[PDB]
Every structure is written in structure tokens, then in C-alpha cells.
Amino acid sequence: MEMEKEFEQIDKSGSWAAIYQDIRHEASDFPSRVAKLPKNKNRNRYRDVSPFDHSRIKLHQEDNDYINASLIKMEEAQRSYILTQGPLPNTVGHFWEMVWEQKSRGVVMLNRVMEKGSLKCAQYWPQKEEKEMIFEDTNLKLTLISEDIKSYYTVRQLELENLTTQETREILHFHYTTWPDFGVPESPASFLNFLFKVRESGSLSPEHGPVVVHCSAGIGRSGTFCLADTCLLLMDKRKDPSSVDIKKVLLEMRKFRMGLIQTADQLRFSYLAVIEGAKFIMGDSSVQDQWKELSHED
Ligand SMILES: O=C(O)C(=O)Nc1sc2c(c1C(=O)O)CCNC2
């Protein structure tokens, strides 16, 4: 495997920071004019994280269509993702409006609400079955139907109802609860077990709208998740691990949203996760059971 030789060269020479700096230097810069309009200042969580105009998601709303969210369209892989920031208290209605309008089936949350003593995301889903949430600004009702709590992640089944039309949809919420901000998962096994649970749910299927992926900013942990999933899909289509250039894929994804992957360690972890996941792609389905056991999910 050529990425496995690349990994060893970089690791033994301690070069991860230099490689990551090269990526930052080569990454695309496109206008983000809409994000910076004064009327949108309170729709952005971080001043330095903005969607590009060309790939931003537009709300179907005539007053103000802005949400801090980007469509990542991986044409070669035939998979799309919506990456967004953790919603703010005033944007939780916009968040669910986007989910509705884009026909998403799953939401992947890679952060906790409180991290490092600060609030990184609003509580945007209900905590109890009998206490539904109503978003008066966007006319949606959200109900918790069930939750399956594991040791390091939680899966929730939510019902989203459009109060204008009375039509309902089931949304799956996949919540990774042990991935630190600016950090990496505990092991490739834990990460891959979680990714494959998302895959197996059908949420990434082309018959649904794009999956919504977020962390606090929608770039660091979110980018790591999407990079690994896309690389494994590209390897699967070709059945050729040596045709996937992880750095080129990341640069392609950065055409659609700035800043994807925020540390050299997250880049290094992306390699490890793709190298380990390749074992399943190339025909050893038993590794998936090993990942579940090493993840201590139960
Ligand atoms: O949640 C992530 O993984 C992520 O990218 N977080 C990010 S990226 C980013 C910040 C944060 C943050 O959480 O403080 C602070 C502003 N600079 C960029």
C-alpha cells in the first residue's frame, strides 16, 4: 500500500507539521462575502470560520437565506456532505429548516455541548420523549423517539414534523461523545466502528439528501470524519488502495469549505484510519467485529 509507505516515511522523519503546513499553503481561497455581511454577524459562531459563497447552503427563506453551512460534493466518490457549525441559540430553528429542506436522513455530531469549560454548541435536540421542541421561527416540531446509549457514542431516533404541511420524517442522530476538540479519537477502531454504524444506517445513501456533519466549527473533527469516509469509498470503487492520495482528496474537499482538518495530529489520524479501514474494503469483513470489540462499545 503506497499510503502505508508514505505514512512510515513521514512518521519516522517526524514531518507531520511540515506536510500539514504545505496543505494549508496550497488550499483554496474563495470569496465568503455573504457570511461577512453585518446582518449575518450573529449567525456565525467563529469570526474566522465562514462558508464560501459558491458552496454555501441557502435556506429557502426570503428574508435571510444565510446559514453557516457548506455542501461538500465529492463527484468522483458520488457522495455529498453538508458541513456546518454547532448551532447557536438563535440558529437552532435554521439548522432544522436546513435538515428538512435538504432531505437529510442523518445528523452526525462529533462534539459535546460543553468542552474545555466553554459552550461549543447549543442543545438543539430534546432530552426527554415527553418534552418536544417547537421552533416557532421555522414552523418545525422535533420529538425524541428513542436513544441507544453506548460507552462513547449515542444514537437517537428523532421525528421532525413540518407544522405547515403536517408531514413527518425520521432523523437519525449519531453523537460521538469522546472526541476532544482539536484532538483525535481514542483509536482507529473506535472511530471506524462509529463510521460504519453511520454507513450501515443508510444515512449516506444517494437516495437521501446529504448527511449533516458538525462539530463546534464544522471543520476540524468534521473534516477528519468526511476525509476518512471519502477515501474509503474511493478505494472501494476502484478496489485499489494505491490509487488514493489522501492529501489530494483533502485539498479537493477544501475547495468547498475552508480549514478542514485543524491539526497535524488529525491529519496523521486520518491516514491511520484509512489504512486500517482498507482491510475491510479489500475483502476482510471480520475486521469489523474486531473494531467493535476494541471500541468497548458495550
Ligand atoms: O469543533 C472542531 O473540531 C473545530 O474545528 N473547532 C474549532 S475550529 C476553530 C475553532 C474551533 C473551536 O472549537 O474553538 C476556534 C476558531 N478558530 C477555528
Side-chain angles (χ1 to χ4, degrees):
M1 191 169 306
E2 209 250 331
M3 54 167 71
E4 198 157 2
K5 312 192 207 315
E6 194 167 79
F7 180 86
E8 287 190 28
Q9 283 177 58
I10 302 170
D11 223 44
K12 292 217 276 289
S13 67
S15 294
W16 287 103
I19 298 310
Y20 179 69
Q21 278 301 121
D22 283 354
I23 285 165
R24 296 176 80 252
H25 288 165
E26 285 298 291
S28 299
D29 188 31
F30 292 112
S32 53
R33 302 186 181 112
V34 176
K36 298 171 178 186
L37 294 172
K39 62 167 163 158
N40 291 324
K41 212 165 294 308
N42 68 6
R43 293 183 180 211
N44 293 314
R45 177 173 287 282
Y46 300 113
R47 83 193 334 268
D48 60 331
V49 181
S50 299
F52 300 139
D53 294 327
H54 78 84
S55 56
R56 74 183 181 96
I57 297 294
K58 297 178 190 163
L59 302 173
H60 306 174
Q61 249 172 357
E62 291 177 340
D63 46 324
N64 187 342
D65 66 12
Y66 179 78
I67 183 170
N68 192 318
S70 308
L71 181 67
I72 313 316
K73 204 161 209 64
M74 299 307 293
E75 191 180 346
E76 231 266 355
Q78 302 142 298
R79 189 160 289 169
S80 301
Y81 314 89
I82 292 170
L83 270 58
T84 189
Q85 69 184 14
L88 294 154
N90 59 311
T91 70
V92 289
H94 307 154
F95 176 90
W96 287 113
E97 178 187 355
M98 172 181 71
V99 170
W100 183 270
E101 288 168 358
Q102 300 299 315
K103 296 188 169 61
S104 312
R105 165 65 167 156
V107 174
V108 176
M109 173 171 182
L110 301 171
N111 64 289
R112 294 174 109 194
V113 163
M114 179 171 291
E115 305 180 321
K116 291 163 158 22
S118 294
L119 295 171
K120 295 302 213 186
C121 185
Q123 179 65 49
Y124 63 87
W125 72 94
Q127 281 164 317
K128 291 176 182 178
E129 286 90 334
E130 67 272 27
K131 263 140 179 46
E132 69 278 13
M133 292 172 81
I134 297 166
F135 304 106
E136 299 195 336
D137 57 330
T138 56
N139 249 265
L140 295 162
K141 179 172 86 171
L142 184 69
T143 305
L144 171 69
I145 300 304
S146 33
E147 25 178 36
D148 184 17
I149 302 180
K150 305 296 191 179
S151 69
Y152 71 100
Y153 70 96
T154 297
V155 181
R156 306 179 176 96
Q157 183 193 340
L158 308 166
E159 173 191 277
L160 187 61
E161 175 175 358
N162 180 318
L163 294 165
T164 308
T165 70
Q166 299 298 290
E167 65 211 324
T168 65
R169 291 182 196 157
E170 178 182 82
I171 307 295
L172 295 176
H173 190 248
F174 297 90
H175 188 188
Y176 204 119
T177 60
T178 56
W179 189 343
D181 200 2
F182 294 106
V184 295
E186 312 96 295
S187 65
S190 307
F191 171 81
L192 287 165
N193 178 62
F194 178 82
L195 170 61
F196 274 77
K197 287 287 301 197
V198 178
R199 286 184 163 211
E200 289 182 338
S201 74
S203 299
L204 302 175
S205 159
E207 68 218 6
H208 300 301
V211 69
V212 175
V213 182
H214 79 86
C215 45
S216 184
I219 61 176
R221 293 169 278 186
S222 290
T224 304
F225 178 94
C226 297
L227 181 62
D229 181 56
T230 289
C231 287
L232 287 170
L233 187 57
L234 289 167
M235 182 183 301
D236 205 6
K237 194 172 63 100
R238 309 153 179 183
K239 290 307 201 192
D240 185 355
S242 295
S243 72
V244 178
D245 185 331
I246 296 194
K247 310 182 295 302
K248 186 183 300 197
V249 176
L250 178 56
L251 282 168
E252 179 75 18
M253 296 179 62
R254 276 189 176 218
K255 296 176 177 176
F256 297 97
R257 188 171 175 80
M258 64 176 53
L260 303 183
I261 299 198
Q262 280 284 294
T263 74
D265 241 274
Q266 285 170 352
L267 180 61
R268 182 183 183 271
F269 178 88
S270 293
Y271 274 73
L272 284 173
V274 173
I275 290 168
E276 173 68 18
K279 295 176 187 175
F280 177 87
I281 298 313
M282 298 307 296
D284 183 3
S285 297
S286 78
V287 304
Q288 188 173 355
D289 298 316
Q290 292 151 46
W291 299 339
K292 178 177 158 195
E293 280 274 275
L294 296 153
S295 81
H296 317 303
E297 155 187 296
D298 302 300

